[PDB]
Amino acid sequence: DGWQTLKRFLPYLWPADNAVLRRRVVGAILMVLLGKATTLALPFAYKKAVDAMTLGGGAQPALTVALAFVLAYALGRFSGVLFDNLRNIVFERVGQDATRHLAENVFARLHKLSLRFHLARRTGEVTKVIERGTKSIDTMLYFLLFNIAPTVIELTAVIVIFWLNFGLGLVTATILAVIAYVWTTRTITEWRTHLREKMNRLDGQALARAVDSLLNYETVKYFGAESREEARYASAARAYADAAVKSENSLGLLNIAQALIVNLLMAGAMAWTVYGWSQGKLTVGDLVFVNTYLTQLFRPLDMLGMVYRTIRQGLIDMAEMFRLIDTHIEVADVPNAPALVVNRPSVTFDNVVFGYDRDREILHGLSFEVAAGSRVAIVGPSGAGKSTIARLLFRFYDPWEGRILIDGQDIAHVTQTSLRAALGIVPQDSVLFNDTIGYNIAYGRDGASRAEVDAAAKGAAIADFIARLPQGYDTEVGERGLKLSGGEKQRVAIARTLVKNPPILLFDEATSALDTRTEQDILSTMRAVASHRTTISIAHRLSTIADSDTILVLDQGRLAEQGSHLDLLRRDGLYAEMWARQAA
Amino acid sequence: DGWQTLKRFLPYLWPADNAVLRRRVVGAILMVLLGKATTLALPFAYKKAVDAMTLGGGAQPALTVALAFVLAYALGRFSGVLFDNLRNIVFERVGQDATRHLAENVFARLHKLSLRFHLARRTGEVTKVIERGTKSIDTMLYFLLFNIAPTVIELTAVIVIFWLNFGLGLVTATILAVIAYVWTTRTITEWRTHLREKMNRLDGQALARAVDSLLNYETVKYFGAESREEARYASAARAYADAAVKSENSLGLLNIAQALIVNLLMAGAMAWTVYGWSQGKLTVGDLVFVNTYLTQLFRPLDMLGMVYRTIRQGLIDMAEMFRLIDTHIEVADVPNAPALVVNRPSVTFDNVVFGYDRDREILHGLSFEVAAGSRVAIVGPSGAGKSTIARLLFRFYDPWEGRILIDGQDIAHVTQTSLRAALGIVPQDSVLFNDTIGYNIAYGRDGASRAEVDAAAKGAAIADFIARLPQGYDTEVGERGLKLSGGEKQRVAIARTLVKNPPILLFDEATSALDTRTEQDILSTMRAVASHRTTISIAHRLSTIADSDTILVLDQGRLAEQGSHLDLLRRDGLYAEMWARQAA
Ligand SMILES: Nc1ncnc2c1ncn2[C@@H]1O[C@H](COP(=O)(O)OP(=O)(O)O)[C@@H](O)[C@H]1O
Ligand SMILES: Nc1ncnc2c1ncn2[C@@H]1O[C@H](COP(=O)(O)OP(=O)(O)O)[C@@H](O)[C@H]1O
Ligand code: VO4
Ligand code: VO4
Numbered sequence A, B: 001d002g003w004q005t006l007k008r009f010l011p012y013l014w015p016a017d018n019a020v021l022r023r024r025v026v027g028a029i030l031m032v033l034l035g036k037a038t039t040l041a042l043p044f045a046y047k048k049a050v051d052a053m054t055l056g057g058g059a060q061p062a063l064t065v066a067l068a069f070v071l072a073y074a075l076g077r078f079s080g081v082l083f084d085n086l087r088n089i090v091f092e093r094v095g096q097d098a099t100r101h102l103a104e105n106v107f108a109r110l111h112k113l114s115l116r117f118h119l120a121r122r123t124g125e126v127t128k129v130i131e132r133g134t135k136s137i138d139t140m141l142y143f144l145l146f147n148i149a150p151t152v153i154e155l156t157a158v159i160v161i162f163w164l165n166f167g168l169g170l171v172t173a174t175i176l177a178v179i180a181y182v183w184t185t186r187t188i189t190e191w192r193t194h195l196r197e198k199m200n201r202l203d204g205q206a207l208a209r210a211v212d213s214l215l216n217y218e219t220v221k222y223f224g225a226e227s228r229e230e231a232r233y234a235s236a237a238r239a240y241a242d243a244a245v246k247s248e249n250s251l252g253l254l255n256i257a258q259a260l261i262v263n264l265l266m267a268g269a270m271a272w273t274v275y276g277w278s279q280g281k282l283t284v285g286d287l288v289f290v291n292t293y294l295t296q297l298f299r300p301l302d303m304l305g306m307v308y309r310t311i312r313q314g315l316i317d318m319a320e321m322f323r324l325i326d327t328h329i330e331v332a333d334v335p336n337a338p339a340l341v342v343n344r345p346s347v348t349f350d351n352v353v354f355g356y357d358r359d360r361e362i363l364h365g366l367s368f369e370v371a372a373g374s375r376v377a378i379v380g381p382s383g384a385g386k387s388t389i390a391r392l393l394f395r396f397y398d399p400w401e402g403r404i405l406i407d408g409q410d411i412a413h414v415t416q417t418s419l420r421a422a423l424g425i426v427p428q429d430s431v432l433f434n435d436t437i438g439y440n441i442a443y444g445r446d447g448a449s450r451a452e453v454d455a456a457a458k459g460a461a462i463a464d465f466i467a468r469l470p471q472g473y474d475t476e477v478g479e480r481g482l483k484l485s486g487g488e489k490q491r492v493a494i495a496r497t498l499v500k501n502p503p504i505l506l507f508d509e510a511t512s513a514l515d516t517r518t519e520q521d522i523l524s525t526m527r528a529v530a531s532h533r534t535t536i537s538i539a540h541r542l543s544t545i546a547d548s549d550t551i552l553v554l555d556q557g558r559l560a561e562q563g564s565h566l567d568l569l570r571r572d573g574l575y576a577e578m579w580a581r582q583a584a
């Protein structure tokens, strides 16, 4: 509930560092206290000012006493407002710092979590949650913190004052009033919360549908599907509006009940006071006093019945953000993991059995050894699952059984960072940042110099194409570089991995989008650049890999045939069939 | 400014076809008027109740007179709240309907706009603006509409009452108070707005950067670049927080000045009233009367100073939404465009000159004719720009000069819908909706039956693969189909286009991710399905298109060679070189 959320948020407000920020909170609390004391004082001055005017005076009738007391009243009101604005000004920095640290922590945690949480994740939910939560925590914190506590202080103070100045039927009346108020408010809020949860869930679903439609604009255009999308959005919007109408009607009923109770209590107290006046026990200033005290007390509470809905939503949103921060990490490093030390880059697969889900096993005891410095190819027909090999090597997931070794070391027992530092990959579908081509190429290593980018662009055979562009390296690619052709994007990917210069390199359909001459050029660069590293090339078109040291042919998640190109042509098996057929 | 935004928004509030809602708005305004009248009346009753009890009495001036008037006071207070909540409950339906129609209009317009918009922007900004704006308009409409107009009514009424009951020094004093109030508020708000616009732009930029970081999770993982993104986000967040601190300081100063003016005016009025009382012109009830009137008047205005920031941001966002709605459409249908009639599907290109930007011309007077029913291929090396042809054919852009005709008809003069209805395309990068495989295949034509999907899945040679999946047609595939292999995605794309059954079909490197046997299979299906349509196949690997009726070879935006496969091999030109090289 909300109480747990606030208890979780409380450590951020009173940090255990920054000795400077801690003092400001104390000062702000002191300002709050002075403001309350002044606003509490001013009605006693008003009551006495009224008392003086009627039934004689002490020096002069009203020339001096009435003027002095009216000016004291006005100056008091102004002083209270001044203190309130001063507390706001002093406090605002602590809040800004607290929310900045919350945002930074959530961002870091989201980058640390496992990919399986990224494979099915809607863009709209994450973006909406972070934007909404930052705005939410600022609004909720200010309204919550600075319009509830002083009212409690004033309620206790008023109880004390009634104690000191009257008989205690007033005390019993007010205590019963507060008890009724709390019980009624709680039961109504309980009824209201289920409908609130339903409304919020429907809103989130509608927004995610809308974003997916907008994100697939090309496909919606190709098939003329505009009307279908419009109807699909319209239905969700109507359902949401209905739920909202029910929610606000219940809010209105709760507000009417609360105002009835409050005004009943005021009626009763004023009546008892006038009855007491009839017997000559009390002056009429007592009447003015009680009236002013009650209205001053109840103004902050009546203010709230029109900011309720927002505060509620804010509290929900903050709970949501903590929920996101709490989800656990599926794949983590072991305790005290040693660093990876790569001296001779052999690769061993030892009886690896794996699948994404327990109901579909994909690899069936695949074992093989890739010798250091050798050039090997991995081929198979479609659906083979060869792209898992690579995804497993980077430890995006762990094997159910068996193990992977690099230089004789179990990759489950080493640090993730050294492992991924030792490996380079060129994937099938490469994504570009929304920035210049020069930034995208320099991204491979921290601080890439002009010489490294020039060398890589030469090795990638894109130098002339860039030279003929008007803006050169500053040509914008757009979103996912959708402004560049496929061969251009694949060349940028090759350049990136060239800039990394990793000891072990993986080509994952690296050449599939290029023309023949470009292909032969980059293939020659790849052969030259492979001098003393382990290179694994996964290719569809066999002619580009026929000179490999060894070829692994996978079918249906297992190793069907293994050996050199000549051995497989002699065996007359699957490889021979594939190659012969393709040649014709 | 805000005034223009509100004037634009007002037609949504007072509709013109339902008529049911129009009566409800009238009823709500009537309730507002009753509530204000009651809250205005009850202080006169209080002043008189005070006047009766002191210095005389009509009958029994101790219990009967005082009880009736205090009870009337309490009942009046309660009745005002009751009317206010009743107006809220009655009005709530109109707001929901208005915001629903606004959202629907923005969605439809966003779908109608030109592609060059989409390819220039970030997903996060548009999603943020639509979510933020709907929440913004609802909150702003409620606060704006129901906490400003009654204060104007009350101020005029109080002016009238002072007129009727006193001499007009009070009137001039209030007039001067209002004039000073408005002038001060305007000039301070003017200073504050420049800082506000900067704050908002900085926030938008930071959020866009964050979303692009999250959207490129794979690449950021591949290069261990987490620290760079964390620092990059952190700096923007600090800049934003600084700007926010300046803004709130200026708001605090404005609030203090306003409260000073208000409390000075009350001081003066009550002082003058006491001075007048000293001469016996006025009873003591007058003091309470004036005090209560002023406090009741100013209580709604003191509250606004703590909802100001929110309303301001809301108004900004509502302006933003209309700005988006107004942007003009680059490519529009001509007036009275006739429908397309496809009787003989020939395609003519007539001297088409085009480029994306006026500083880089890509096609240099390309002209050609594709005869109805022929099988033509378009080939070239990389960067050729052959991928522009299709985008031009669908009229995503217009030619600078020349024209394209189908059956002889200028495509610029026909309706966009009939034109795109006659064309099918299989693009290089195919996008999947976040849903099941069956939904994605059935999407090609509205209401697609089970027989058509079965026939298409057979023709695409994916039936066995789907049969071996546990959930079959109900298999989830992620978003952008990132869960499927490349061959699977390309097969789904082929199936969609087969489901459309268009008379003209374009294969844009359709066979690129498949193995040899799958390729030969689908190539046979295509050949069979091509019987009486025009088919244009753009292919990198020449062997797959050697049997075409004719092949067009493009280089650098021009036609290098044209003719049948044997003619080009005899010519010993570019085609011969490319083919020979690839074969070896
Ligand atoms: N995220 C995933 N969730 C569930 N199944 C998956 C996922 N990714 C891949 N699969 C399965 O992995 C196989 C694809 O492996 P892959 O090596 O990419 O084949 P290909 O080389 O033809 O692209 C498919 O059978 C697919 O169903
Ligand atoms: N949307 C675009 N905006 C700016 N330049 C573009 C855009 N699309 C293509 N270009 C340029 O067109 C050429 C590649 O276009 P394309 O037709 O895809 O060639 P190809 O057929 O070889 O893939 C490049 O020069 C590219 O910069
Ligand atoms: O997308 V292309 O440059 O390969 O024709
Ligand atoms: O679908 V694949 O065989 O190209 O990775």
Ligand SMILES: [Mg+2]
Pocket: A385, A386, A387, B485, B486
């Ligand atoms: Mg694969």
Ligand SMILES: [Mg+2]
Pocket: A485, A486, B386, B387
């Ligand atoms: Mg291309």
